[model samples]
Target chain A: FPIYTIPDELGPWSPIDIHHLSCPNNLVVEDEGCTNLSEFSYMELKVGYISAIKVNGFTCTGVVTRKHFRPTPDACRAAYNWKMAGDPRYESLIIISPSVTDLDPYDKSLHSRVFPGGKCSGITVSSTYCSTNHDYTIWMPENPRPRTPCDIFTNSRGKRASNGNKTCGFVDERGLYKSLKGACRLKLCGVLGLRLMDGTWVAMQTSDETKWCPPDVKKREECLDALESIMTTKSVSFRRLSHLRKLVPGFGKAYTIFNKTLMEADAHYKSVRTWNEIIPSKGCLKVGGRCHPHVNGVFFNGIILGPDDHVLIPEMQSSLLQQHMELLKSSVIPLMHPLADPSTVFKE
Target chain B: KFPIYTIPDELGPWSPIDIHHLSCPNNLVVEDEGCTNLSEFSYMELKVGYISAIKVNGFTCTGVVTEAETFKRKHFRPTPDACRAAYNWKMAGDPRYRTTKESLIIISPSVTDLDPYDKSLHSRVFPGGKCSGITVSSTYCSTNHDYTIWMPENPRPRTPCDIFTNSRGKRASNGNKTCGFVDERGLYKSLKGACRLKLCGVLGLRLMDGTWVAMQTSDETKWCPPDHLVVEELVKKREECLDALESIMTTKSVSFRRLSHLRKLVPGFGKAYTIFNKTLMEADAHYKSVRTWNEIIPSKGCLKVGGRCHPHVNGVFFNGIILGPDDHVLIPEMQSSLLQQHMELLKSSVIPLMHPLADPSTVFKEGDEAEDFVEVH
Candidate 1:
């Protein structure tokens, strides 16, 4: 008859009783509902030689199907080389580690959702005896309270170890936050006027900065100039000028000019105030009005404050209604002309 | 060189005449006709000379002669006076020429009138022919245009040289009206009974009393009864029965007859006639009832009559009716009890066969028979 070797009890993640690893009495459970034996309220350590010698324990064997680390570049390189040699177009890369003795069988509550067992373990080691000062820690199975990485396990064996050495179970927030801060720096430096590196919230001085454009500044003249150009020329259109102004924010100046032109093209707008009200009331402003064909309500008002309601400039709506008349007359004809058939040169 | 005399324009039956001895410029039509005289002479000399005398000396000669010299030419071709003279001396010449087998029996009707001149008799009537008959010249009838007497069996067996004495003699009696010949040994030796003479109207042979003694020449060859022949009285009785039957059939319009007289002559007619009568009655019943119309029949055939149900007559009708050349109703695949009974009669009886004749007449007038009577082919 062939002798069968019993597999090694999993170390940290195994759901078996930890005392089964040895004939120790230190293991105990604080709660009866605790599912994982490895996650008992108390635990003890055992060696294969000692357990086998004392209790006639069988030999332990284990196979690693996953690991808790991003593959080292060297490991990825090695996997890539093997795959290319076998089949260059292969998609999956393999990562290897020591025996997977830490996987939990009964504590499957957080198995695939968070841990994704052995998928991205921390690291690998060349020799198991390099660190002989073994220390143990309690395993919290579900939504464990966060703890400082250094306080997770105590060095009571008087064995020296590196303080910053990362392990499979280590967790710290400083390194991740440092990477996020770098991304914010790149975004802040690309803005226009504020000195990103001066460490002060001040406008540049020597450059005639009285009219400096904030990152949030509105170019009222530039917007009106664009609107006037469209009003004087037959090809100018309030609809298209309104669309061009929307490409950037704070183009309120161009919208105001566009409303005056609309008032001139259509006499219904009595003054700037009426022009303002009517032009902004037009549903073409994405932030202002009920523009959808099926929506029936006053342009600027709705009880539900749906996607069609005004999301910008809520205070100036009354003034905007007065300016709409001038812009409608000036721009409505020119806007309509481009879409119509221009006089055919050969028609005469 | 011998004087070349043209061969006389006559040759008796089985007589050889040499052609190399004839004169040149031989006329194939006038002289030779279809006769191969030279070939016959050569054949006789080459093969039969040892058995015949006249031909042995003639084979060496290269010229024609009018008559045989080694044998008396008068015995071969005798004049009328010489024939009478030979008839007077015929008793000493040969015993075959002296004996007569049987004397001709004279009957009321001239046998010649009864014996129509049919060329078919030449096969059995000539002297060397198969039957016992007088050998007369084909031209003898042309010259006299009378039925001359020829003694077929003489006092002795005569050779071809004695033809003049046998055929050219005068008749034994003159002014006689009726004479009939009879075979003393019966027509065939296998038959038994007194040889009686009777006339068969269809074929003019007198039926001598014997088994297989045919009354008609056609009957003698093919139509002879396999059983036996009858004598003259029985032959007359058979004719009488047939005539009576024909009369009764025509008058009564019934082939079935209950006659004690006709039973012996027509042996199987009763049963056959009964079947025929039954067929007619069934036919009359069906013809009156069968539906008919000038309608387009089905393209594929279907069973029209219940035959398997009847178990006796199985019939199927074609969808289309076929018409004959005369626009007569050929057939419509009729299978009825009547038709099956009629077919059975035809198969067994030696009667005329019935064929699908024609459609019934359109008009149903009184006394007008339907034209549906089928004819025998």
Candidate 2:
């Protein structure tokens, strides 16, 4: 009679009809009546033995038998190479699997190679030595290293880093004081001078520049003196000059001279600071930290540094005088031209 | 000086006791002696009476009434010259008289006893006396002209103008005139001669009784005497000839010829003469031509007896006779041949002659031709 038993559990030499077994306590057999013994002893298995083993049922002399097999490390390596080739994420890293021949055989006294350096090699090893009965070794980079200060900043704070050690003083001073003072003085002289010259304040506003400057600056003696002189003497003369400008038949002659001088001043000012000069500077000054030293002491006085310090005293004065005349002509001459002020011209 | 006449009664101018000559005897201062008192008449007195003598102081003169003052005259004729001169004066003064001198000449004769014949010869004369009170002489005047006979044969009577008489005669016949039996018999014989020669007596009638004579002349012996063999022979030949004509074609050539000949026999034969000539000419020129004996007969020979004749044979034929002969060629033979028998062929053929392209063949095929032919039949 042919014996009948669970085929996968029994060795080839074992009887297929055995329904029971009496073995050591460490040996285990399930209800299928086949031996279920482990290949390792308690100590060897707990530590590690073969990197990997495979058992397969085979027919020997017309009877089924259990056969334990192990692959060459080269085969394991080839398989890992194939798997790694399939994944492009690991395509640049060297990969190794269990049973690799490139390393020594198992040494119980050696520590686990946890930190693989420089080579960036990844190894995957399998054995019965580790806890839970199998061990594999693999190492992959967790986070990219910082290469530069900008990179250190971007890595830590996640933003594009700027150049070093810049104080807010330049921006605050230019934005708050220099720009405001320059804009304010231009407005104060322009507004009061325009009002006095034209007899109408259509485009003039004292509040525009008053709001830009410190309120206390309006009370300063130089500021007060400048305003008084501009509003009275200079403005009156400008007003008289506007009358002289009107004596010309067409307004564009005076207008062109006035506009040309202002545009020259604007060009001089806009190109005064270039990027090459700004890049190496601690601040926008030749000697000290004060950016506009000449205009610093003025305190809303009409007299201030022009576009460049190199601007000659005569040319500067001439430009200022020309601007004064322009303000007068532009604001006043148009109001006095032909057919202007219908109410006044037609008054009874 | 005033003077008195005491002369003898018969001597120089007599004033002896002539109180009867006194115009106002009571107003005259006369002496008791039966004489006008010369001494009583004073020239200075200015007496309002007939005075023979007037004396102022010793001078005296005598006065007499002139013969011109007596209103006596010789007889004068109311001549037209004077009357016309007077009339001219009046007419010249009148606002309405804008007439010419010729119109005055015409007008003057009616006003006086002026001769109308004389005035008419003087002025621009018309047949009717358009001038007032003038009568035309020798010829009566109508609205148009002077007429030898004033009465018209018919109202709206068609009279051929001298310019178009020959042209009109081709379409219309002259006025009818009465004829004697000989003339009538001659007219009938000539009209039926062709029909008789063709032996188709269908167009002929008996002379005594208005009965149709049979086409066969052998049947005619019952009506005429047997001894008149020449008449029988002539009649027999006429019958045989017409039989030959009738036998010529199913198109009724004999009837067409007989009708054509009968048109020539009647006076004022209506438009049939025009129609027959046009249809026969067109048929002969288009269809095959048939010969007849009357080809030798003179055209105006029938007109001598006051009858119509074949237009081709007659000298009065119009110029449009030969027009569009080929146009009729397409017409069916029977229709073209029978067209002469249709009455409207007269009116229809005139249209084609007037407008050569007018298809009279189409008009003949229409029922209008049949209706017109029925009236003719």
Candidate 3:
């Protein structure tokens, strides 16, 4: 009468003297002459449900079979749990879903391993069998490992913190600048970032915020009202007003009011300027008026520049005027404000 | 009383104044008043010497002998001198005064002594004084002979009656031999005064007239009239009868009987002779009173007589009766068809007979046949 006892590290196994052993988890067990012993008459220690076993307190390593190992969602989740539990060996184990093939032993599904963590966490398994028979020993630290600086900033999703106050500025790990947060902050001041008309940054004060935003409400409302009335009238004048309104919010209506008012103002300005420059002085009128005299002087200058010029008076006036008008009309002007009235902006 | 005396044939003296006295062959005396006259005292027995005083024969006789007494007489005869005297006497009172002047006119008294009886009398008048007056007178007689015989109708004076027989039978007077007479027993009996008589005595008989008279004297023994000679004589006789007919027809005696004798002698002489007479007779009958035969004047003798005259005669006598052997004569048929043929032949043949006698050797030869002679017994 000899007594047979199970190993301690083989935490879970069958108690029968002739029972067969199977691995339900990724583990390994080993024994010597375990096959000859039948019952407890002679005491036989058998390896089961482990990665390595001891007989008579001697350790024996088992040979590993070559069957390929496939990772399930559960395995990956378990591996991740082990890693979270501070098992150092869990990092060496490769964890992949069954859809993955090829021996990438170093490949791990750490982020996609568990629910709410990896893409394959809710995947179903087809059979109840572990892919490999070997169990790995895990190394654990005496105290939990010291956290890194990046680790402090990283969230569970492996993203760095974007704190409002701090300037956590960094290029990515590959050193590429894709994030506009740092650049946008640099290009704009902190106070509702604003750009000047000349492509410069300025910190807007609260009072000046209105300036950085759209036009004043009262002004905009008045403009809109005026545009409505003008558009109504312009719509009556032209048949394409509806299409123009569709293209430029209130362009047709606003342009009509601006054109009429600018034309009236221009007429008055010309009348006043001509009267002051030429009509008030009878002497100037007698001397071919102010603008006419200057125009003749220009024509005389052109005559001096050219070899085949004939300065016949009155005969060349209409011709010169026509040439000057064509020049002014055909020449291009640089852009000003986009909202400026075309009529007033393009005066002669 | 004055005595009357008669002139006698004797010589006597008688009273110077007497009324009648017969001339005798005795002395004549005269007494007065018984005074015993001594003149011849025979007054009582005076026989009147002759017939110085004739008382019985006549009552008173006067013997007278005027100075104008004549013995010559005038008459017409065949002699040259006789014919000349008669011609002169008849023409003495003619109204032509030239006749009386030429009758008495004489030529070459200096040449008048030549004998005219000389054979060379014509040559003696100028050279010989032998019978010059007689030769001249005989020459005048010879000229008168030719004139009387040939041109009897001329009015020229001839030899005077005193020289009538003085130049008779002289060579100069008888030079033509046609002025003499012939006996009627000779060959010229038929011709009568027409034949030139001197040519007839050569051979007892000879018909020498016209151109034949020369041939007979030249050669009478062997000569016969050559055809051309006969043509010549016939032409002469034909012209004479034509003239007679011309003259006779003009008068009231234009009877065919008056022309019959001329027709027998000349009208049948030869064909040419017959054509000539017939043409004249026809002409005479046609005109009835023609004085000249000029209307039927033939071509000249050589043209009308020599070659074509016989041809013309033979043509005219083609069927007519022959008149004689040597004579190519035709009888005129009142209805003769050949008359017109004869006239045409005459007209055509007349020009070829002009000079028929020009060459006798060519015109006739011995034994030459007579071309147009009709032989008849």
User: Which of the numbered candidates is closest to the native, going by highest lDDT?
Assistant: 3
lDDT of 1 at B98: 25
Q: Write the per-residue lDDT of candidate 1 for residues B1-377, one digit (tens) a residue.
A: 11111111111112211111111111111111221211111000001111111111000001111233342211112233223333444435532212212111111111111122221112111232212322343211111101122222222222332111111111111133211221221111111121322322222221222112222212233232311333566555556556655554444322222121233221100110111111211110000012342122222332223222111121211111222222232121232332453334322311111111101112322432222221110
For each candidate, report its DockQ versus the true two-chain complex. Answer: 0.00, 0.00, 0.00
Prediction 2 global C-alpha lDDT: 0.20
What is candidate 1's lDDT per residue for A253-342, written digit by digit as tens?
A: 121122111110100001122223333453432222333221232211111122445422322322232232222112100001111223
Off by over 4 Å in 3: A1-348, B1-134, B137-203, B207-304, B308-377
Where is the poorest 10-residue window by lDDT in model 2 chain B? B164-173
Model 2 regions more than 4 Å off: A1-348, B1-140, B144-322, B325-335, B338-377
Better of 1 and 2 by TM-score: 2
Where does the lowest 10-residue lDDT sum fall in candidate 2 chain A? Answer: A259-268
lDDT of 2 by residue, A1-348 (tens): 111100111111111100111111111111232222212111011001111111111110100122112233333334354553564332121222221111111221111222221121222344311111011223221111211111100001111111223111111101110111122221221233111111111122333334333211122343344334432432212211121111111101111112111100000011112222312332233211234233332201122233443311222234333443232121100011111112212110
Kindly report the fnat of each predicted structure, to 2 decimals: 0.00, 0.00, 0.00
In order of lDDT, best first, we have 3, 1, 2
For A1-348, candidate 3 gives per-residue lDDT tens digits of 101111111122211100011111111112121222111111111222011111110001111132122233334444545644568542123322111111111121111111121221111133222222122211111112211111111111112222343322212222211122212211111234333221122222221222333211123443345345433443221111111121111001111112111100000001112223322432232112332232322221011111223222221233333333232222111111211212212111
Off by over 4 Å in 1: A1-348, B1-138, B142-209, B212-240, B244-377
